[PDB]
Amino acid sequence: YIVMTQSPKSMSMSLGERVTLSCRASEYVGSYVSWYQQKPEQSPKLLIYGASNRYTGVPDRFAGSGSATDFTLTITSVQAEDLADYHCGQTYNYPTFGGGTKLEI
Amino acid sequence: PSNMSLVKETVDRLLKGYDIRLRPDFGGPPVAVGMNIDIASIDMVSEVNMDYTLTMYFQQAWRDKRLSYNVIPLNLTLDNRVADQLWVPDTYFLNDKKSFVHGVTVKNRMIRLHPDGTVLYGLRITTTAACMMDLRRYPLDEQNCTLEIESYGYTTDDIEFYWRGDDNAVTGVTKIELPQFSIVDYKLITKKVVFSTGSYPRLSLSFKLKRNIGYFILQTYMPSILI
Amino acid sequence: FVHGVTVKNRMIRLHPDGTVLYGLRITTTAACMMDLRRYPLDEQNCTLEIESYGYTTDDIEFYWRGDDNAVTGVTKIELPQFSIVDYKLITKKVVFSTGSYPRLSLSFKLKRNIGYFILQTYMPSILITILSWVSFWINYDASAARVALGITTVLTMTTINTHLRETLPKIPYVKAIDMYLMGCFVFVFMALLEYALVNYIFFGDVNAIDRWSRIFFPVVFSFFNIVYWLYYVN
Amino acid sequence: DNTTVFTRILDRLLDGYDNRLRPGLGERVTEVKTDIFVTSFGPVSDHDMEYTIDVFFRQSWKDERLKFKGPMTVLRLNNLMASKIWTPDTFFHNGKKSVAHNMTMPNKLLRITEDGTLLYTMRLTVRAECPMHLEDFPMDAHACPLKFGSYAYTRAEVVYEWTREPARSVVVAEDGSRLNQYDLLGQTVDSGIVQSSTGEYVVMTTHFHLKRKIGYFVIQTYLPCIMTVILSQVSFWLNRESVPARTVFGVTTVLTMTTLSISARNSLPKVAYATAMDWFIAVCYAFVFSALIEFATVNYFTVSKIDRLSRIAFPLLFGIFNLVYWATYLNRE
Amino acid sequence: EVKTDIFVTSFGPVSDHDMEYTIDVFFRQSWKDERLKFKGPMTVLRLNNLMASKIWTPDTFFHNGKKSVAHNMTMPNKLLRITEDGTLLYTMRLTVRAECPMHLEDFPMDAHACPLKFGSYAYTRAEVVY
Amino acid sequence: EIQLQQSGPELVKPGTSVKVSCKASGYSFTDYNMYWVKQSHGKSLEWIGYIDPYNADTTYNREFKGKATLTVDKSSSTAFMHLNSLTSEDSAVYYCARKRNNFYFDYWGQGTPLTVS
Amino acid sequence: WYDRRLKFNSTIKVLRLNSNMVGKIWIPDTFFRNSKKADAHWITTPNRMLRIWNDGRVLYTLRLTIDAECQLQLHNFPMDEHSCPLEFSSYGYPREEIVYQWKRSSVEVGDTRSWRLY
Ligand SMILES: *[C@@H]1O[C@H](CO)[C@@H](O[C@@H]2O[C@H](CO)[C@@H](O[C@@H]3O[C@H](CO[C@H]4O[C@H](CO)[C@@H](O)[C@H](O[C@H]5O[C@H](CO)[C@@H](O)[C@H](O)[C@@H]5O)[C@@H]4O)[C@@H](O)[C@H](O[C@H]4O[C@H](CO)[C@@H](O)[C@H](O)[C@@H]4O[C@H]4O[C@H](CO)[C@@H](O)[C@H](O)[C@@H]4O)[C@@H]3O)[C@H](O)[C@H]2NC(C)=O)[C@H](O)[C@H]1NC(C)=O
Ligand SMILES: *[C@@H]1O[C@H](CO)[C@@H](O[C@@H]2O[C@H](CO)[C@@H](O[C@@H]3O[C@H](CO[C@H]4O[C@H](CO)[C@@H](O)[C@H](O)[C@@H]4O)[C@@H](O)[C@H](O[C@H]4O[C@H](CO)[C@@H](O)[C@H](O)[C@@H]4O)[C@@H]3O)[C@H](O)[C@H]2NC(C)=O)[C@H](O)[C@H]1NC(C)=O
Ligand SMILES: *[C@@H]1O[C@H](CO)[C@@H](O[C@@H]2O[C@H](CO)[C@@H](O[C@@H]3O[C@H](CO[C@H]4O[C@H](CO)[C@@H](O)[C@H](O)[C@@H]4O)[C@@H](O)[C@H](O[C@H]4O[C@H](CO)[C@@H](O)[C@H](O)[C@@H]4O)[C@@H]3O)[C@H](O)[C@H]2NC(C)=O)[C@H](O)[C@H]1NC(C)=O
Ligand SMILES: *[C@@H]1O[C@H](CO)[C@@H](O[C@@H]2O[C@H](CO)[C@@H](O[C@@H]3O[C@H](CO[C@H]4O[C@H](CO)[C@@H](O)[C@H](O)[C@@H]4O)[C@@H](O)[C@H](O[C@H]4O[C@H](CO)[C@@H](O)[C@H](O)[C@@H]4O)[C@@H]3O)[C@H](O)[C@H]2NC(C)=O)[C@H](O)[C@H]1NC(C)=O
Ligand SMILES: *[C@@H]1O[C@H](CO)[C@@H](O[C@@H]2O[C@H](CO)[C@@H](O[C@@H]3O[C@H](CO[C@H]4O[C@H](CO)[C@@H](O)[C@H](O)[C@@H]4O)[C@@H](O)[C@H](O[C@H]4O[C@H](CO)[C@@H](O)[C@H](O)[C@@H]4O)[C@@H]3O)[C@H](O)[C@H]2NC(C)=O)[C@H](O)[C@H]1NC(C)=O
Ligand SMILES: *[C@@H]1O[C@H](CO)[C@@H](O[C@@H]2O[C@H](CO)[C@@H](O[C@@H]3O[C@H](CO)[C@@H](O)[C@H](O)[C@@H]3O)[C@H](O)[C@H]2NC(C)=O)[C@H](O)[C@H]1NC(C)=O
Ligand SMILES: *[C@@H]1O[C@H](CO)[C@@H](O)[C@H](O)[C@H]1NC(C)=O
C-alpha cells in the first residue's frame, strides 16, 4: 500500500500564528489526498478534499495545497477551537492514513 | 421529480410548433450570430498539398425569441441530439477541402438554451482548410493562412456575423506548438462580401504562420555549405 | 466493412425447419502481434478471434458446423510473400469477470517466403561482402587502389540498408535481417581496418601479415555465415 | 410466459422518458462512474505525434427514471434501445480520430439493473493526440494522455469519477502491447477541472507512461556513425606521402554521413529544435569534416610530425564527446 | 429546360500522375416548374436542405467525374430558392475530381484542354435539355 | 441529517468473536460503499475493509484478511462488522465511514471502543 | 429482367424514372466476386436509372467504379498478357432462382484511346 509520511509530529505554535503541515507520499497519488481533523474523543472531521478543494461548511482559515507526492496544509491564523489531531490520507489506491499531528500553544 | 418534470414541460413547450425552416425573426432585422473559437490544435501543415489541418471548438451564439423561457432560472443544456430539431446558421467554410464533426462517443455538439433565448450552439470540427501558399522564399517565408467563414444561403439583410468578445473571440492559439511553424500572430476580420446575388456576411480568421528555420538550417543549408 | 456494391453484400435464407443461414461478405484488417525477431526467417502466427459481445455462454454458443469443413478456400489462397502452412480452428469458452463468453479462434500459421527475400535482401549484401574479399588480393607495395575499393563497399552497404529500412518496422531487436546486415558491415569495416594496420606496419614479416590476413578473412566470414544460418534457420 | 413479462418491461421502460434531459436535471449532479480496459496499446506514430488505443470504454451512471421491478435483476438493451436513453456525451479532448467499431453489429452493451443503475460498456479505437517534446529522442519517455469528459455538461451538471479505486480503474490486457519501439511502463490517472469559454468541465486524465526502446536506433544509426568516425581517424594512421589515398578515404567518409543523416530524420516530424539524435549526427559530421580539414592541413606541408598530434587528439576528443553524450542523456529522466 | 451555370470557386490541383484535376464549383442550375407556383408577400422563398430533397431536381451527374464529394460542413452546402412563378434556383457547392485525359507527348510544354462534361443520367434528350 | 450511529463500547475476553454494527441514516444506504477503519490509541487509523452493500462484495485489508468479516442488512440499513479470535493487541476504537466520492470520507461513525483484557 | 408485378397498360410505353425508385422495387443483389472495393457514384444524385415497360421489362442500370482483383502473376515481366475477370453473381440467390444470361451486344467497350490502360 501507500505510506503517508506526516513530517510534522506536532507543533507548539501560538494562537493567531501561521501554522503549516506536510503530508508526504511515497508513490504517486495524483491529487486524491484528503485532510482530516480529529478532536479528542471525537471522530475525524474532513477539512480539505482533492488536495486543495475545501469541504463545505468548513471555516475558510484552512487552505490545502500541493501536487502529487507533496501535500501541505496551512492555516493563516490558528484559533482556540482550531486545535486538534491532524492526519492526512490518500485514496489513489486502497485508503491509507498517516499519523496524527496535534496543535498546542 | 417536480423540478425535472417542469423542465421537461418547458422544453416540450419550446420545441412545440418550432419551424426549423425559418430563421430567427423572419421578416425582420438580420439576426446577429456571434462566433467564438477555441483552436484545439493546428497540425500537418501540408505545403505539398497547400493546406493545413485545423481542429477547433466552433461555438456560434445567436439570439432567438421563440426559445425564450423564464420558469427555470438555470441554463438548460439539452442533449446534443436536439440540434437537428432547431434552426442553426447555414455556416460553411469557404476554403475547406474536407471537414467532419468528431464521432465518438456521440456526435460532438452542444446546445444551451439560456433564459433570454440565446442559444450557444457548438461543434468540435476538424477541417483541412486550404490556403494558397506562396513558397517563393521558402523556407525563409511566412504564410497568411485563413479560414473564411461565410453564410451559404442568407444575405446580410437576413444574417449578420461578428466575433463575440471581438479580439477575445478566438482563444488557445498561443498554446499551439506546430512542429515547424511558429504562429507569430492571428487577426480577426469582419467583412460583407459583395457577390453577384448580394452582400453576404463574412468572417476571416487568419494566422500569420512563420517557418521555423531550425530544422531547415539543421539539414538543408548546413550539409550543403559543408560540401 | 461489408462490401456495398451493387447492393449491400449480405444474405438471408429461411430454411423450412427454421435454420436461418445469415452470411456477409466481410473485409477485415484484423490485428496480429508480429514477433519479427526471426524476420525474414519467421513463421508469423496470426488469428481471427470471433466472439459474442453482450451474450454469455448461457444464452449463446458458437461452433464450427462441420468439424473442419467450416473453413474453406484457404488452400487456393496465393499470398504474395507468404505460404499458409496450416490453419486450425479452436472453440474456447473464455472466462471473463462477468461470466464465461463463447469464442472461436481461426488461426493461420503464415510462413515467410524466403525465396523472394533471399534475392531481394540477402543476395545483394552477400555479394557486396564477396567484393570486400577481393581487396586483399590487390597488393601491399602500392594499395592506394585497395583503400578506394574497400571504402566504396561500406557506401554500397549504407545505400542498401537505407532502401531496406523503408519496408521494415522499428522493433529494437536486431531481427534476422539487421543482424546480418550489421555483421557484414562489421566484416567489411574490419577489412578496411586490416588494410590500415598492414599499411601502417609496412611503412613504419610484412608479406606474412598480408597472407595471414588473406587466409583469415574468408574462413572467419564463412564461420559467421554458418553460425548465422544455423541459428536462424531453426 | 417469461418473454411476455420481459418484453412488457422493455416496452414500459421508455414510456415518459425524455432523453434530451440528463437524469435529475435541476436537482442533483449526474455522477458517472467510469473505467477503461485497454485491449491493446496501438502503435505510437511519432511522425504525427499520436497513438492508437483500443479500449472497452465502460461507464455507469445512476438514473432514477429507468427503474423496473421483475424476475430479472439485469436487463439487456440492444443498440437500438441504447439510442433512446440519455447516454453521457463523453468525448476525448485529444482525440484526433476515433472509430466506434460496429461489425458485425454495433459493439455497444447497455444494461439496466433494478435500482436504475446503468452500464454502457462499448468498444472504441481512439487515435488520440500525444504532444511529444522530442528533445531527448531517441532516449526519451513520453506520458501520452487520454483526457476525456463531457462535451456540453458543465461541472455543475455531470461529474466523472472512477468506479473502482483510481489505480484499479484502468486495466491493460496482459498481451495488449502493440508497440514497435515503445514499452508501456504503466498507467496513471487523475481528475481535475478545466476552464473553458463555455464553463468549467471535469476532465479524467489518464497518462500512459511510455519509454522509447533504443536498440533499433543504436544498430541502425549510432553504430554506423561511430564506425564511420573511427574510420575517419584511421585515415590519419595510413600515411601522409600517399596523397590520393588520404583524399579518397576522406571524401568517401564525408559522403556516408549524408545518407546516414537523411535516413534518421525521415521518421521524425520536422521539429525545429535538434532532437538530440540530429545533435549526435551533426557532431559526428563535424568530426569527420574536421578530419578532412586536418588532412588538408597536413597535405599542404607535404615524418608525420603534424599528424601525430591529430592521431592522439581525435581519439581522445571523440571519446570525451561519446562518454559525455551517453552519460548526459542516459542519466537524464 | 435546365439552365445551368458554374462559378469555379477554386481550380484545384491538376493530378498529373492520375490524369485528373480537382475543381471547387458553385454549380448553379435553374429550371421552370409549374407545380411549385405560389403567390405571396415574398417573391423568393428560401428553403432548407430538407425541402430540397422533397422536390424534383435534375440528376446532373458528371460524365468524366471520379470520386466527387459534396461538402457538408457545417450543414449541407446547397440552397433552393423558389420564385413566385416557379423558377427554381438550385445552387450547390462541389469538389468534383473530373478526369482529364492527358497526352503527355509534348511534355513539359504539353497543354491540355481538360473537360468537365456533365448531363442528366436518367433522362434522354427528349425529357431534359441543358 | 446523515448520522452514522454505532452499537457502542464493548468488552470481552481474548479469543472470543465480537460483532459491531453501524447504522446509517438519511442518504441512500446502497449507493455509497461503507468503509470500516480501526484506530489504536494515539496511532494512525487503519482501514479494515469496505462492503459495497448492493452486491455485498468486499475487499479486506491484507493484514485483516480473515480477521474481520463484513456483512450488511438491506432491510435495516445497517452495516455489521464481525471480529474473530480477539487478542490484546487488537483493542482499539473502530469507526465506520462513507466514501462519498473517490476523494474524501464524508461521514464517520460515533466510535466503538474495543477492550481485550 | 422481366417482372410480372410491374405491368401497366396505358398509352405510356415506358416509365422513365430517376434513382428515387431504385430502392422501392426489387433489385437483383448482384455483386462482383473479385471486387476489393467498389462504390456507385453519388454526385450530384445517385447515378442510377430505372425504365419500365408495359410488358414488365425493367432496365435498371447504374454507374460503378470497381477496383477489381486480378491474379497478376509476374513470372515473365513485362511480358504478361492477362485476362483479368469481372466475375459477378447474385450473392444469396441460388442458381435455381437467378440466372444471368449475356446478350450478343453485352460488353460495349468504349473509346480505348482515352483509357488509363497505360
Ligand atoms: C456500421 O457503420 C457503418 C458506418 O460507420 C455503416 O455504414 C453506413 O450505413 C448507412 C446506413 O445504411 C449508409 O447510409 C447510406 O448512404 C447512402 C450513400 O452513402 C454515400 O455517402 C456516404 C457519406 O454520406 C459514403 O460514406 C458512402 O460510401 C460508403 O459506403 C459505400 C456503400 O454504401 C461504400 O462502398 C464506400 O466504400 C463507403 O464505405 C456513399 O458514398 C445513401 O444513399 C443511403 O440513403 C438511401 O438509402 C436509405 C436506406 O434506408 C434510405 O432511407 C434513403 O432515403 C436513401 O434512399 C434513397 O436513395 C437510394 C439511393 O440508392 C434509392 O435507392 C432509394 O430508393 C431512395 O430514393 C444511406 O443514407 C452509409 O453510406 C454507410 N457507410 C458509411 C457511413 O460510411 C453500417 O451500416 C453500420 N453497420 C454495419 C453492420 O456495418
Ligand atoms: C447562464 O449563462 C450566463 C452566461 O455566462 C450567465 O450570465 C452571465 O455570466 C457571466 C459570467 O461569465 C457574467 O459576466 C460578467 O458580467 C458582468 C456584468 O455584465 C453586464 O454587462 C454586460 C455588457 O458589458 C452584459 O452583456 C451582461 O449581460 C451584464 O448585463 C461583468 O461586470 C463581469 O466582468 C467582471 O468580472 C469579474 C467578476 O465581476 C471582475 O472581477 C472583473 O474585473 C470584471 O469587471 C463579467 O463579465 C454576465 O454578466 C452574466 N450575465 C449575462 C450574460 O447576462 C448566467 O448566470 C448563467 N445562468 C445560471 C448560472 O443560472
Ligand atoms: C450532411 O449533414 C447533415 C447534418 O444534419 C445530415 O443530415 C442528417 O442526417 C442524419 C442521418 O442521415 C439524419 O438522422 C435521421 O433522422 C431521421 C428522422 O428523425 C426524426 O424522425 C424520427 C421518426 O422518423 C424520430 O424518431 C426522430 O427523433 C426525429 O424526430 C431518422 O428517421 C433516421 O433514422 C435512420 O437512421 C438510423 C441510424 O441509427 C437507423 O437506425 C434508422 O433505422 C433509419 O434508417 C436518422 O436518424 C438527420 O435527421 C439529418 N439532419 C436533419 C436536420 O434532419 C446529412 O445526412 C449529411 N449528408 C451527407 C451526404 O453527408
Ligand atoms: C492576412 O490576409 C488577410 C486577408 O483576408 C488580411 O485581412 C485583411 O486585412 C486588411 C488590413 O489588416 C483589411 O483591410 C482594412 O482593414 C481596416 C482595419 O481597420 C483599422 O484601420 C482603418 C484604416 O485602415 C481604420 O479606419 C479603422 O478605424 C481601424 O483602425 C478595416 O477597417 C477595413 O474595412 C474598412 O474599409 C473597407 C475598404 O475601404 C470597407 O469596405 C469596410 O466597410 C470598412 O469601412 C479593411 O478591412 C482587410 O479588410 C482584411 N480582409 C481581407 C483583405 O479580406 C490580414 O490583414 C493578413 N494578415 C494577417 C496577419 O492575417
Ligand atoms: C497460432 O497461434 C494460436 C494462439 O492462439 C494457436 O492456438 C492454440 O492452439 C492450441 C492447439 O490447437 C490450443 O490448445 C487447445 O487447448 C484446448 C483447451 O485445453 C483445455 O481443455 C479443457 C477445457 O475444454 C480443460 O479442462 C483442459 O485442462 C485444457 O486446459 C484443448 O481442448 C485443445 O485440444 C487438446 O489439447 C490437449 C492436447 O493438445 C489436450 O488437453 C486434449 O487432447 C485436447 O483435446 C488444444 O490443446 C490453444 O487453445 C490455442 N490458443 C492459444 C494457445 O491461445 C495456434 O495453434 C497457432 N497455429 C498453429 C497452426 O498451431
Ligand atoms: C457474349 O456472350 C454471347 C452469349 O453468351 C455471345 O453471343 C452468342 O454467340 C453464339 C455464337 O454463334 C450464338 O450462337 C448462335 O446464335 C445464332 C443467333 O441466335 C443462332 O441462330 C445459332 O443457332 C447459334 O445458337 C449466340 O446466339 C449468341 N448469343 C445470343 C444471345 O444470340 C457473344 O459471342 C459473347 N461475346 C464475345 C465472345 O465476345
Ligand atoms: C390492360 O388492359 C387491356 C384491355 O384494355 C388488357 O387486355 C390487358 O391485359 C391489361 N393489362 C394489364 C392489366 O396489365
Residue numbers in the entry:
A (entry chain L): 1 to 105
B (entry chain B): 6 to 232
C (entry chain E): 105 to 308, 459 to 488
D (entry chain A): 9 to 310, 388 to 418
E (entry chain C): 39 to 168
F (entry chain H): 1 to 52, 52A, 53 to 82, 82A, 82B, 82C, 83 to 100, 100A, ...
G (entry chain D): 82 to 199
Tell me, in the authors' exact words, what the paper reports.
Type A γ-aminobutyric acid receptors (GABAARs) are the principal inhibitory receptors in the brain and the target of a wide range of clinical agents, including anaesthetics, sedatives, hypnotics and antidepressants. Here, we isolate native murine GABAAR assemblies containing the widely expressed α1 subunit and elucidate their structures in complex with drugs used to treat insomnia (zolpidem (ZOL) and flurazepam) and postpartum depression (the neurosteroid allopregnanolone (APG)). Using cryo-electron microscopy (cryo-EM) analysis and single-molecule photobleaching experiments, we uncover three major structural populations in the brain: the canonical α1β2γ2 receptor containing two α1 subunits, and two assemblies containing one α1 and either an α2 or α3 subunit, in which the single α1-containing receptors feature a more compact arrangement between the transmembrane and extracellular domains. In all three classes from all three datasets we observed two α subunits, two β subunits and one γ subunit arranged in an α*-β-α-β*-γ clockwise order when viewed from the extracellular side of the membrane (asterisks denote subunits adjacent to the γ subunit).
To investigate the molecular effects of insomnia treatments on nα1-GABAARs, we examined the interactions with either DID (inhibition constant, Ki 16.9 ± 1.7 nM), one of the major metabolites of flurazepam, or ZOL (Ki 22.9 ± 2.7 nM) and nα1-GABAARs. Both compounds engage the receptor ECD at the α1*+/γ2− interface, which is spatially equivalent to the GABA pockets, each sandwiched at a β+/α− interface. The binding of DID in the two-Fab dataset is reminiscent of recombinant GABAAR structures in complex with diazepam or alprazolam. We observed a slight opening of loop C due to a 1.2 Å displacement of the γ2-S205 Cα, as well as side chain reorganization of α1-H101, γ2-Y58, γ2-Ν60 and γ2-F77, which enlarges the pocket to accommodate the ligand. Intriguingly, the minimum pore radius in the DID structure is 2 Å, possibly representing a partially open state of GABAAR that has not been observed before. We speculate this could be due to partial occupancy of the orthosteric binding site by GABA that copurified with the receptor, and by the presence of DID, which may potentiate GABAAR activity similarly to diazepam, as previously reported. Accordingly, we observed incomplete loop C closure—the structural hallmark of GABA-dependent allostery—in the GABA-binding pockets in the DID structure.
